[PDB]
């Protein structure tokens, strides 16, 4: 297999992503450098097979029944439909540039694919019966990184990661309507790698970084150049946008990427790729902080470097490059996919 | 007498303007004078010469030890909530004729205090918790059910909410909604009376300019002043010494 963006060969799978069946019996790992998807039995924790897909998959999504796996092939500019039981790819549908993510609707009738190409703004919809692209939903700006569907199933958010932009936003889509109702801008943000929903659907979490672009590059202290942040947005109309720090004063979480939401919404799990660790936060303390604070106070608290310790549950050692994380349906276990170490770290959560 | 006590000067709304923090004690039949309120008459300064009305209310009768009135149990207020006067309790009392005034508050058994579980919490459940949940701070719901904090379950949700500290404020002064031994400085009391009571503002923005709701008509005078008394007493949780039947820490 090839290292991304290069013609150089490697024998290493290099997992870029991970997910889990709704019945929690199977883990599906997208191998970026392996151009395939590894199947892992959750119970025995060993590999049950490797399914060949198109070239450089960065993402995957499982149908509610768990009979199919929809994989996002980034360089092939496509999406592979794989039979889970047969361990074989039964189709290839082709989409806009660089899908970085795909999600299946609650009814399982539809799959939404975020096209992350720098000059490309699209969310391509795919009927599961036709097993083909239906239409395309144009976002407010370029390069959607990932989407997420509400538990309601009537709303779809897309994080827009836009090159050459300090203010990076999130689009709200009405699934029945199929276009943009509202666009909410995260100010002074960059590199949004994920978006997740709270079980009650009243909030969304987005991992990103806050650069200071307008300042000289001088020291590394007190996040003079980059700080790392998680933002909670209230799905309510006119809701708050709360930018919160992931960092200590002398300890930062480099490049937060993947997110896993606790089934009951008690904890938030954040893959930290740069510092190779999983940051676990208490969501009732976070949301408690959001509800009890004004917008001004939150905006001031974004730069508080001692704030994290209030809502921070843990930081757990992981393999190198944990770009993605996922949870078991009972929420008692958290899996983190490590690219460089070519493995998966299994974590026992606080849930008992 | 022979018991530790201190005192608080009160305004026309019955709230403490200044609290004397110390422990004073009187011997039997003894009495004590002071020129002022921490004026320095008992510390660094000579007694100021003062002709006071209280001097004539002290002992005027030859057949009595003291003609001065005993401490009253309650207060009476007018329709606006102003101080109307002082009110007798049910502790009234061998006994001999050695004082002119009715004997009140000498029974240690029946001495009244304000307990959060017995007094305040039911008021909170009745008049408050309906609109106040996790989504609308402070959270007054949950009843008397204990909330575990850092592996310790002591008080309820409402108590934990009301006693919560505020950023940039000395906890020795107060928290977000509560200033111990000052009701007049407490944001909660500020909102319950819907006015600025003191010269010390609890925080920068107090009364919302949008979506504000008047809280002054939610409580009767007895309930509101019960909260005032609770805060002025130091805003405790368990005010009944020793283990009792009311909800609390158990292992
Ligand atoms: C529904 C009719 C309510 C009842 C019953 C109670 N409160 Fe309330 N409260 C309500 C709203 C809509 C708001 C928003 C802000 C505002 O000023 O209107 C509040 C707010 C408070 C506050 C201020 C919180 C803060 O500024 O940080 C306090 C201190 C408060 N509420 C206390 C309180 C008490 C003691 C109640 C029982 C008498 C009570 N509330 C009832 C709505 C409603
Ligand atoms: C207004 C309230 C009063 C009144 C009517 C009296 N005192 Fe005094 N007192 C007062 C304050 C604010 C303080 C200090 C509180 C603190 O430091 O936090 C005190 C203190 C005392 C003390 C302790 C020693 C000292 O601080 O000087 C003693 C003893 C004392 N007060 C005695 C006292 C006497 C004899 C009074 C006459 C009735 C008296 N107090 C009245 C405030 C107030
Ligand atoms: Ca492409
Ligand atoms: Ca007790
Ligand atoms: Cl004095
Ligand atoms: Mg330096
Ligand atoms: Xe760690
Ligand atoms: Xe005193």
UniProtKB/Swiss-Prot annotation, chain A:
Keywords: Signal. Component of the hydrazine synthase complex that catalyzes the condensation of nitric oxide (NO) with ammonium to form hydrazine. The beta subunit may play a role in modulating transport of the hydroxylamine intermediate through a tunnel between the gamma and alpha subunit's active site. The keyword rRNA-binding does not apply. SUPFAM superfamilies: Nitrous oxide reductase, N-terminal domain. GO terms for cellular component: anammoxosome. Pfam families: YNCE (PF21783). Induction: Is among the most highly expressed proteins in the proteome. The keyword Ion transport does not apply. Pathway: Nitrogen metabolism. This is Hydrazine synthase subunit beta. It comes from Kuenenia stuttgartiensis. Part of the hydrazine synthase complex that forms an elongated dimer of heterotrimers composed of one alpha, one beta and one gamma subunit.
From Swiss-Prot, chain B:
Its main location: other. One of its GO terms (molecular function) is oxidoreductase activity. The keyword Metal-binding applies. Disulfide bonds: none annotated. Heme 1 binds at residues 34, 37, 42. The alpha subunit consists of three domains: an N-terminal domain which includes a six-bladed beta-propeller, a middle domain binding a pentacoordinated c-type heme and a C-terminal domain which harbors a bis-histidine-coordinated c-type heme. This is Hydrazine synthase subunit alpha. It comes from Kuenenia stuttgartiensis.
